C-alpha cells in the first residue's frame, strides 16, 4: 500500500477476420515518498483490470532512491532505447521541474529539488523505463568509497 | 578418502564443447578431453557443503533437480532418503516463478488422492473412471517429488545447470541461492554454489549426490550406510 498514480493509459488494437479486437495499457508509478518507488506496465482486456495489474507489477519492481536533502546525490544521464534523460539536483527550495512521466515518477520517489530534460524519443513508456534505470544507478559518497577500500 | 574416490573414476568430462568461462576450474586436455582440476574442486566442495550444512542444521528445505536419464533415478533415491522435494521428470516451467499456479495442480493430485479410496467410485460412468485415473496417473507421474513443501525452497541443488538452466533462471529471479554440479558444458558465474565435476557418467553423480544427501542428515542425526546405487551400475 503506497501512493500509486498512473502515468498514461492507451487503447491498442490487433486485426482479425471480422474486425479489430483491442486491449488497454496502463503505466503506473508507486511510492511512499521516502526513497521507495516502482514502475509497472500492465495490459488487459479492460481499463479497470489493466490499471490493477499495473499496481501489482509496480510493487514487484521497486528501487531504493537515495535522497540527500529531498533532492539527489549526483547528476546523471541515461539512454534507454531512443530516449535520453537528464537528472540534475537542485538546491533545496526549487521545485521538481519535468514532464509528466519524469515528474510523476520523481514525486512519489520523494524528490522535491530536481532539474530534468527529456531528449531523444519522448515516448512516455521509454522515458519511464529510462528514469528508473537512472535512479537505479544513484550512488552516495558512502557506497562509493565503500568500493574504493582495498 | 575424498581425493581417492573422485579421482578413482569421477572427474574429467566434456571436451571442446566447453565454455571459456568455466576455465578457472581446468587442468588440461588429455586425449582431446577437458580434464577438470579436482584439487580446486575440493576447495569448492568444501564451501558448497559449508552452505548445505549451515542450512540443514537450520532446518530449511532444498530442491534437487535432474531430468537427464543418466541421472534421473539416482536423484529420486537420494531425495526421499533425505526427505526433500525433487523433480525427476520434465521440470515444468514457472514452477517456482509461478508457484501459486503449479501448486494449484498439486491440490488436484490429492483431490484425486482422496477420491481414490472412496464410496463415490461405485457410481461415475466408466468414462470418468479411465479419465480420473489417468489424470491421477500423470498428475502423479510429474509431481512425485514436487509436493512436500508448499513454500519456495531456501535453495536449489542441481545436476547439469546448463541442461536445466530454465530452472536456474526461475530460482535466480526469485533470489533462491543456487547450488549445482556443473562440468565444462556449463557456465560458473550464474551458480552461487558450485560443484565442478563429471555430469554424465552415473558414477560421479552418486559420489557427490550421496555425500551431499549424507551431509544433509549429518545435521539431524542418523549416520548410516549410503543409499541404493548399484543394481545395473555398469
Amino acid at each position: 500500500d503506497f501512493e500509486e498514480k498512473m502515468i498514461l493509459i492507451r487503447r491498442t488494437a490487433r486485426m482479425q477476420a471480422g474486425g479489430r479486437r483491442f486491449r488497454f495499457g496502463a503505466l503506473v508509478v508507486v511510492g511512499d515518498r521516502q526513497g521507495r518507488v516502482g514502475l509497472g506496465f500492465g495490459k488487459a482486456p479492460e481499463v479497470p483490470l489493466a490499471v490493477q495489474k499495473a499496481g501489482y507489477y509496480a510493487r514487484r519492481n521497486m528501487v531504493e532512491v537515495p535522497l540527500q536533502n529531498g533532492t539527489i546525490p549526483h547528476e546523471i544521464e541515461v539512454e534507454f532505447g531512443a530516449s535520453k534523460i537528464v537528472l540534475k539536483p537542485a538546491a533545496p527550495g526549487t521545485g521538481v521541474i519535468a514532464g509528466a512521466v519524469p515528474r510523476a515518477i520523481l514525486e512519489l520517489a520523494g524528490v522535491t529539488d530536481i532539474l530534468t530534460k527529456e531528449l531523444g524519443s519522448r515516448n512516455p513508456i521509454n522515458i519511464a523505463y529510462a528514469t528508473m534505470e537512472a535512479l537505479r544507478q544513484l550512488r552516495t559518497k558512502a557506497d562509493v568509497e565503500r568500493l574504493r577500500k582495498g | 578418502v575424498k581425493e581417492l574416490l573422485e579421482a578413482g573414476v569421477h572427474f574429467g568430462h566434456e571436451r571442446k564443447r566447453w565454455n571459456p568461462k568455466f576455465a578457472r576450474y581446468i587442468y588440461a586436455e588429455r586425449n582431446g578431453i577437458h580434464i577438470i582440476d579436482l584439487q580446486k574442486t575440493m576447495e569448492e566442495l568444501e564451501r558448497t557443503f559449508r552452505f548445505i550444512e549451515d542450512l540443514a542444521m537450520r532446518g530449511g528445505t532444498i530442491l534437487f533437480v535432474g531430468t537427464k536419464k543418466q541421472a534421473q533415478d539416482i536423484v529420486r533415491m537420494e531425495a526421499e532418503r533425505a526427505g526433500m522435494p525433487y523433480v525427476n521428470q520434465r521440470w515444468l516451467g514457472g514452477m517456482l516463478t509461478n508457484f501459486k499456479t503449479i501448486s494449484q495442480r498439486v491440490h488436484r493430485l490429492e483431490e484425486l488422492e482422496a477420491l481414490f479410496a472412496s464410496p463415490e467410485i461405485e457410481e461415475r460412468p466408466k468414462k470418468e473412471q479411465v479419465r480420473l485415473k489417468h489424470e491421477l496417473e500423470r498428475l502423479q507421474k510429474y509431481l512425485s517429488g514436487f509436493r512436500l513443501l508448499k513454500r519456495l525452497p531456501d535453495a536449489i541443488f542441481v545436476v547439469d545447470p546448463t541442461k536445466e538452466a530454465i530452472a536456474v533462471r526461475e530460482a535466480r529471479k526469485l533470489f533462491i541461492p543456487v547450488i549445482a554440479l556443473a562440468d565444462t558444458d556449463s557456465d560458473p558465474d550464474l551458480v552461487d554454489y558450485i560443484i565442478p565435476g563429471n555430469d554424465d557418467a552415473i558414477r560421479s553423480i552418486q559420489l557427490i549426490l550421496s555425500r551431499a544427501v549424507d551431509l544433509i542428515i549429518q545435521a539431524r542425526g542418523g549416520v548410516v550406510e549410503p543409499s541404493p546405487s548399484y543394481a545395473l551400475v555398469q
Binding site: 546525490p73 568509497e145 574504493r148 582495498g150 | 533462471r169 529471479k173
Partner: protein, 138 residues
C-alpha cells in the same frame, strides 16, 4: 600506430573491466604510470607493476570491481563505471584554475596534467593551478 596512447590505455581498461579481468597491460610510459598512479592512489585499481613481453616494457594493471550481486546477472558492480577522455589529440582542452570541472559532484576524478605534475580536480584546486584536463573518471 596509436595516436593518443593514453586514450588507448584508458580504453584498454574500459574494455578490460567490461568482462572483468585480473589485469590488462598497457605498454609502458613515464606518463601512463603517472596517470595510473592517480587511479590507484584514488582507489580505482589494485595497482600496477612493470613487466615485459620480449624486450617490450608494459604495465600490468590489476583492476578492481565490486561485490558479487544477487538476482539475475550476478556480475559485480564496477569500481570504474565510466572513464572517458577529455582533451583529445585533435582538440587540446586546456583549463584555467577557476574553470576546472567538478566531476559527478566530487564522486569522480578529473585527472589533469599541469605545470607542476599530474594533479586532480581536488589536488589542483588546492595547489591552485591548471592545465591539460586529461580525462574524467568515476
Amino acid at each position: 600506430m596509436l595516436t593518443d596512447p593514453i586514450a588507448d590505455m584508458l580504453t584498454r581498461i574500459r574494455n578490460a573491466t567490461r568482462v572483468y579481468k585480473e589485469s590488462t597491460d598497457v605498454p609502458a610510459s613515464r606518463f601512463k604510470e603517472e596517470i595510473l598512479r592517480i587511479l590507484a592512489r584514488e582507489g580505482f585499481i589494485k595497482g600496477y607493476e612493470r613487466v615485459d613481453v620480449d624486450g617490450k616494457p608494459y604495465l600490468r594493471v590489476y583492476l578492481k570491481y565490486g561485490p558479487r550481486r544477487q538476482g539475475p546477472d550476478p556480475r559485480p558492480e564496477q569500481v570504474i563505471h565510466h572513464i572517458r577522455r577529455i582533451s583529445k589529440p585533435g582538440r587540446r582542452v586546456y583549463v584555467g584554475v577557476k574553470e576546472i570541472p567538478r566531476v559527478r559532484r566530487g564522486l569522480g576524478i578529473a585527472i589533469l596534467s599541469t605545470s607542476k605534475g599530474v594533479l586532480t580536480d581536488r589536488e589542483a584546486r588546492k595547489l591552485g593551478v591548471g592545465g591539460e584536463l586529461i580525462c574524467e573518471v568515476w
